[PDB]
Design a protein around this ligand. Structure first.
Ligand SMILES: COc1cc(O)cc(C)c1O
Ligand SMILES: [Fe+3]
Length: 465
């Protein structure tokens, strides 16, 4: 049973809540500043930084993830404040809380009616805080995620919507033991409305029931997707180059999964997805194997002769993967429930990977990455990640690869673990080495590649010297 901080406040402690992987000596001073900025973010900022029509899809508020991650990697108070303040500048104003709606949401008809509507984000936050206090967080995980009710089944698909930001939030809430962040996570999922995740995950689970072909590790199913004509050709770099006809502004009016993968290769991908069936009696290894496979498909997506670069879309597989360590540690979940969670996450990794062009892994090119700086261990990389001026993706990727190295170490001898122990630090050095002095402009990212599986995506990336 986790000892969660109160639904009504953020309370961190360098020894009680440092998470699964962290810097050596965390200060009280940094912890107090983190609690300050988290509450400013919760009360003042919306879960989405854009309106849906602005760029075509929602952009997400990463401030909770970034602040918490750089605290965990040993950021000083001044650095936490500087990073938080810069990312605050492009936020939307928080929605209004209507207490009557928060109470009425106890009627399942009302709960259902409010789903997918971003104006309900703080209403759901309060509804889930109230649920945590009424029945306890463990009963919340049953009722809103794994107990197999129509409401839990609906929410289990929503945590993956919007490039898996719901399950990232939920993972971080369990890892850092914050009931207030757990309610934020369910609320985030509740207000998404990416209907194609419900269809894909529902149809894939039904197909999996039939057990038509043997189960494979995720690493093997990543490889199988590339052999398929329909899957390997189902997407285009055009999703990352589309412009608004009038203004020439960037948009995602067409979306790789909805308009590409599921339109051109639905049956073929569902046939692969259907083979990711996890053994409820082998979850320590199956959880580590999913985490290794995320590093495999992400850090592996390299193209000689370019510098190492990380794909913005693919790295959500690495950052989402850490939460399964907490799901594994949770007594109140059955082995079958923990298996079903891993299955959903893996099938989404396959969908994301196909949308970016199913990049063929080049671990040989990754392994030869020349370190920009000498004598770089994880502690040196962690400290550099604190100062990297994006919205948190770089530091989350680095901390989650460092976690995966640790969960892989018992299994380094097994063939289904493609990423071997020394390559995790090389990948972390490659990530921070790809960073520039100006990684973002407002909400736009420059340091990450988009469409790693398409040769032309690499044109703006320098050659390795
Ligand atoms: C900040 O850039 C992004 C955030 C996000 O949540 C989703 C997309 C597609 C972004 O480009
Ligand atoms: Fe993200």
């Amino acid at each position: 049973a986790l000892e969660l901080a109160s639904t009504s406040e953020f309370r961190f402690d360098p020894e009680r809540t440092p998470g699964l992987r962290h810097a050596k000596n965390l200060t009280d001073e940094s912890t107090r500043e983190l609690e300050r900025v988290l509450e400013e973010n919760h009360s003042n900022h919306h879960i989405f930084t854009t309106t849906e029509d602005h760029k075509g899809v929602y952009f997400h508020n990463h401030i909770a993830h970034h602040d918490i991650t750089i605290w965990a990697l040993g950021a000083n108070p001044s650095t936490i404040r500087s990073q938080h303040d810069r990312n605050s500048l492009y936020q939307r104003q928080a929605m209004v809380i209507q207490d009557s709606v928060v109470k009425d949401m106890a009627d399942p008809a009302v709960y259902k009616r409010c789903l997918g509507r971003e104006e309900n984000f703080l209403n759901y936050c309060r509804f889930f805080e109230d649920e945590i206090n009424r029945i306890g967080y463990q009963a919340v995980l049953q009722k809103y995620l794994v107990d197999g009710s129509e409401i839990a089944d609906d929410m289990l698909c929503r945590i993956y919507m919007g490039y898996v930001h719901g399950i990232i939030h939920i993972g971080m809430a369990l890892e850092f033991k914050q009931a207030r962040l757990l309610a934020e996570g369910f609320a985030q999922a509740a207000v998404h409305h990416d209907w194609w995740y419900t269809e894909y995950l529902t149809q894939s689970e039904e197909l999996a029931r039939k057990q038509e072909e043997p189960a494979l590790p995720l690493s093997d199913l990543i490889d199988l997707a590339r052999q398929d004509d329909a899957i390997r050709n189902c997407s285009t770099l055009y999703y990352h180059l589309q412009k608004r006809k009038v203004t020439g502004e960037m948009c995602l009016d067409l979306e790789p999964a909805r308009d590409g993968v599921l339109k051109n290769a639905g049956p073929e991908l569902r046939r692969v997805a259907a083979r990711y069936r996890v053994d409820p009696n082998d979850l320590e290894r199956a959880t580590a194997e999913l985490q290794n496979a995320a590093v495999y498909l992400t850090a592996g997506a390299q193209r000689p002769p370019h510098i190492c670069a990380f794909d913005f879309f693919l790295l959500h597989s690495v950052t989402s993967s850490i939460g399964h360590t907490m799901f594994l540690a949770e007594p109140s979940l059955s082995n079958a429930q923990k298996a079903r969670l891993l299955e959903y996450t893996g099938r989404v990794f396959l969908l994301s990977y196909a949308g970016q062009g199913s990049p063929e892994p080049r671990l040989d090119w990754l392994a030869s990455h020349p370190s920009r700086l000498p004598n770089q261990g994880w502690d040196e990389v962690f400290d550099r990640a604190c100062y990297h001026e994006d919205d948190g993706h770089m530091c989350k990727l680095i901390r989650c690869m460092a976690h995966a190295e640790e969960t892989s170490r018992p299994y380094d001898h097994l063939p289904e673990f493609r990423v071997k122990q020394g390559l995790f630090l090389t990948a972390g050095i490659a990530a921070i080495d790809s960073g520039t002095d100006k990684p973002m402009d407002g909400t736009k990212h420059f340091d990450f590649i988009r469409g790693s599986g398409f040769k032309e995506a690499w044109e703006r990336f320098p050659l390795r010297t």
